[PDB]
Design a protein around this ligand. Structure first.
Ligand SMILES: [Mg+2]
Ligand SMILES: [Mg+2]
Ligand SMILES: [Mg+2]
Ligand SMILES: [Mg+2]
Ligand SMILES: [Mg+2]
Ligand SMILES: [Mg+2]
Ligand SMILES: [Mg+2]
Ligand SMILES: [Mg+2]
Ligand SMILES: [Mg+2]
Ligand SMILES: [Mg+2]
Ligand SMILES: [Mg+2]
Ligand SMILES: [Mg+2]
Ligand SMILES: [Mg+2]
Ligand SMILES: [Mg+2]
Ligand SMILES: [Mg+2]
Ligand SMILES: [Mg+2]
Ligand SMILES: [Mg+2]
Ligand SMILES: [Mg+2]
Ligand SMILES: [Mg+2]
Ligand SMILES: [Mg+2]
Ligand SMILES: [Mg+2]
Ligand SMILES: [Mg+2]
Ligand SMILES: [Mg+2]
Ligand SMILES: [Mg+2]
Ligand SMILES: [Mg+2]
Ligand SMILES: [Mg+2]
Lengths: 123, 82, 130, 205, 125
RNA sequence: GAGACACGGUCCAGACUCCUACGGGAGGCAGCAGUGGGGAAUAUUGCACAAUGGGCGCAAGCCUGAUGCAGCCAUGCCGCGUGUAUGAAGAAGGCCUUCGGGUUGUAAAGUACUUUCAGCGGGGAGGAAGGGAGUAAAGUUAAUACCUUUGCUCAUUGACGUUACCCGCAGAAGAAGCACCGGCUAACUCCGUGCCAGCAGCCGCGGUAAUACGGAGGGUGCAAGCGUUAAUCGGAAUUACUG
């Protein structure tokens, strides 16, 4: 409060930790799928969310979400994760980039195609 | 020694030159001592294409500065035209 | 003056698994084929496309994949065949990265493909047709 | 870079007439000017404060036909110039070349005048200018070059301009097809249905 | 064998201009007056139309198509484009015939037979 | 050595790579290109010393991956184009419907025009000042040599470059996508689905009439880009000096 108190101890700030620490300030990271499985969300949601465990090129082992309907991911698949936590899955902080590296785009997707790696349907 | 040469400060295909007094070991567009005018080779008419501070130039020549070849030609233009 | 002849557009993808060719016809995917051609560098890719062969392939690296794409346009003009290959996309008012031509005349798209396949002889498997 | 869709649809949404057609017919004779476009056009919901400023900015952007990046650059220029920022923005839009060509009479619409300017049919001070966003200055003489004086659409656009109101800050000669930009138009010289305070406020959110 | 056929619908009927290696080889005309694309394309697809429109002297309308016929080894195809031929875009109308043709004259016979009864005999240049 | 404890110098040691007749020797791209590797990810082993600048030389000149340019890339900023005017049978088809119609929509077509840019042909600035040959005069000098200085003549000097720009030709031709539409937040309906499949920045949505999921029609916002992710400040007066 007082300025004598400020001269002896200035005001300090909040070193803000990032929610995506395994990206290390990179927009994407490449990793290999250690395991592909399904999890149940927490309340009040009910589903079988598609999820994978990924070992990154920097050695981190993280859990990534697979958005969209259907996927071709197996063990030993080389994917790209981007960042962005799933609200309702505990401990899932990254999204798999559809259409990049091994991961393929969603089928029959006609709207928001660029968010799922789907080519424009020629006709 | 200390020279009086031209530094290329323009855009691509539209060069513009500053006449500077610089130590000769420095880079062309690098460190200099004094700026004593400019030269615009692609200047339009009714526009000042060349302007030289002939009083500071004569001051540096008296102290032993050499003149570049292209600047020695500009001085003959600023004097013959005048 | 129109210059409309038989035409094929061939999307070519080099990747760590090999070389995939997708043949389009009036914008319709008409045929597929694959080749065991693994060549990572652009220089080696362009050398293969021009010469029709390359002596040593690169190693397959499933943990570090890649994908490099070209488009070939084949036209069967009345007296000669042309193929122009562009990196990543058709730029027709700009020159082809690779340009090949043959004196023989083929009337139909099947003859046109035969020219393509014979230049890359021994590499592409038989056509999967739709 | 330009809008190439239906033109009356843009004025049905804005509610008023943007003069996007030559004016040979009454606009009510060509569309439902009172009803917004689309399936849900009859419905007229309430408009929030954000949606009121937005619609006012889209109106001016569509009268002159300027996209968002170039129009945002006008605001920075208008806000930097000394004086009424809301009035500096309408004076910059009124000094465009494709707008001067329309107000003089050489174009039926502003899109038509834009094609005249870009097809090298307009000369400013005796030099052929090609840019629609070219700012015209006071005491500038803009004329139609001799090769284009034979176009029938230039004559048709001059008789339509007689039906409109004469701009005072211009002096056009329909014989020689030349005009003089003598001064920048004041706010009173322009329309009164434009509320430019809404535009200035929208660019300070 | 290949033929490029410029087709013009107008109020006077249907004009066929037949090109061969870029040379105008033959011409013919038909009394087929059909203003609408739907009626035109239906005629083009079906080879006939039951009722023609009435000729208007006062109003002249002109709608143009190009048919390209190719004699592939085991089929003939005829693709007709609105306005102009674009090969990377898809044909507006697609037709196919399970026949072998020896020459351009037979290929015209196929064309003639799809639009049977309409076109007069060829004027050749 | 004026200057270094020296990027393309010397000596010693060390690791690495290479040559050897086994005794011994050679090497240092964080120069420009390029290769391999690492990475989400970042380019051609181009042309020229024409200009500017540097080294050496009396100079001519030689050298210069400095530099000037060329290639590749929507990586950014800025400009322009993808036509203009007319046009109600408010066509067809699509979608919705209270089955009356509504909407897509002057939008299309049709009609009359225009040709930027791209394409083709022709023409054509500036970046060049110098240097070299000649003479004429002046300057010094024994010398009207030589040299220097200053004019005047005669031949020339451009990598870019098929330059910018200008003229001509044909024909609307060669040129629009991306995200969003529960509230925040501009923009709503039908169908599929049934706490599944999925969505999600926050609040939240989905268990049979879902404007929230998926498709469609319509719409809104940006536009040669548009979204997403990462990152910083802002809003945050939420470290407050202002406060
Ligand atoms: Mg969407
Ligand atoms: Mg732009
Ligand atoms: Mg102001
Ligand atoms: Mg020394
Ligand atoms: Mg010494
Ligand atoms: Mg010493
Ligand atoms: Mg040192
Ligand atoms: Mg050294
Ligand atoms: Mg070195
Ligand atoms: Mg290097
Ligand atoms: Mg590499
Ligand atoms: Mg790698
Ligand atoms: Mg390379
Ligand atoms: Mg040089
Ligand atoms: Mg050398
Ligand atoms: Mg660009
Ligand atoms: Mg209907
Ligand atoms: Mg051009
Ligand atoms: Mg010159
Ligand atoms: Mg000059
Ligand atoms: Mg929403
Ligand atoms: Mg709203
Ligand atoms: Mg969503
Ligand atoms: Mg329920
Ligand atoms: Mg439902
Ligand atoms: Mg603060």
């Amino acid at each position: 409060a007082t300025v004598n108190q400020l001269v002896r101890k200035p005001r300090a700030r909040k070193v803000a930790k990032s929610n995506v620490p395994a990206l290390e300030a990179c927009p994407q990271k490449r990793g290999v799928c250690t395991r592909v499985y399904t999890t149940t969300p927490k309340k009040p949601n009910s589903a079988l969310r598609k999820v994978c465990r990924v070992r990154l090129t920097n050695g981190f082992e993280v859990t990534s979400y697979i958005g969209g309907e259907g996927h071709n991911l197996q063990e030993h698949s080389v994917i790209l994760i981007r960042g962005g936590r799933v609200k309702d899955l505990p401990g899932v902080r990254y999204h798999t980039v559809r259409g990049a590296l091994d991961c393929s785009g969603v089928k029959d997707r006609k709207q928001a195609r660029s968010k799922y790696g789907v080519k424009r349907p020629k006709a | 020694m200390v020279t009086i040469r031209l530094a290329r400060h323009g855009a691509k295909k539209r060069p513009f030159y500053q006449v500077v007094v610089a130590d000769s070991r420095n880079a062309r567009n690098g460190r200099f001592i004094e700026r004593v005018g400019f030269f615009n080779p692609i200047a339009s008419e009714k526009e000042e294409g060349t302007r030289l501070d002939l009083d500071r130039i004569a001051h540096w020549v008296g102290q032993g500065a050499t003149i570049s070849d292209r600047v020695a030609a500009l001085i003959k233009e600023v004097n013959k035209a005048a | 003056v129109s210059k409309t002849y038989p035409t094929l557009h061939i999307l070519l993808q080099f990747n760590h698994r090999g070389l995939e060719a997708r043949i389009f016809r009036h914008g319709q995917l008409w045929a597929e084929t694959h080749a065991e051609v693994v060549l990572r560098s652009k220089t080696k890719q362009i050398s293969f496309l021009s010469n029709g062969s390359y002596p040593s392939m690169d190693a397959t690296t499933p943990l570090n994949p890649w994908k490099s794409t070209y488009q070939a346009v084949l036209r069967a003009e009345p007296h000669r065949v042309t193929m122009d290959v562009y990196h990543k996309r058709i730029r027709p008012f700009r020159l082809p990265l690779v340009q090949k031509e043959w004196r023989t005349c083929e009337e139909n798209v099947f003859g046109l493909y035969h020219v393509f396949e014979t230049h890359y002889a021994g590499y592409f498997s038989d056509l999967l047709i739709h | 870079a330009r809008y190439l869709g239906p033109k009356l649809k843009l004025s049905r949404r804005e509610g008023t007439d943007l003069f996007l057609k030559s004016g040979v017919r009454a606009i009510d004779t060509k569309c439902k000017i009172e009803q917004a476009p689309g399936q849900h056009g009859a419905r007229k919901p309430r408009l929030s404060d954000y949606g009121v400023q937005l619609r006012e900015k889209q109106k001016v952007r569509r009268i002159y036909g300027v996209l968002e990046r170039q129009f945002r650059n006008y605001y920075k220029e208008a806000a930097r110039l000394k004086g009424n920022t809301g009035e500096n923005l309408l004076a910059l839009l009124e000094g465009r070349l494709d707008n001067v060509v329309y107000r003089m009479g050489f174009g039926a619409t502003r899109a038509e005048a834009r094609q005249l300017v870009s097809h090298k049919a307009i000369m400013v001070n005796g030099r052929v200018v090609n840019i629609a966003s070219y700012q015209v200055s006071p005491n500038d003489v803009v004329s139609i070059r001799e090769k284009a004086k034979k176009q029938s659409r230039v004559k048709a656009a001059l008789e339509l301009a007689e039906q409109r109101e004469k701009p005072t800050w211009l002096e056009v000669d329909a014989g020689k097809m030349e005009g003089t930009f003598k001064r920048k138009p004041e706010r009173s010289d322009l329309s009164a249905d434009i509320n430019e305070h809404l535009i200035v406020e929208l660019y300070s959110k």
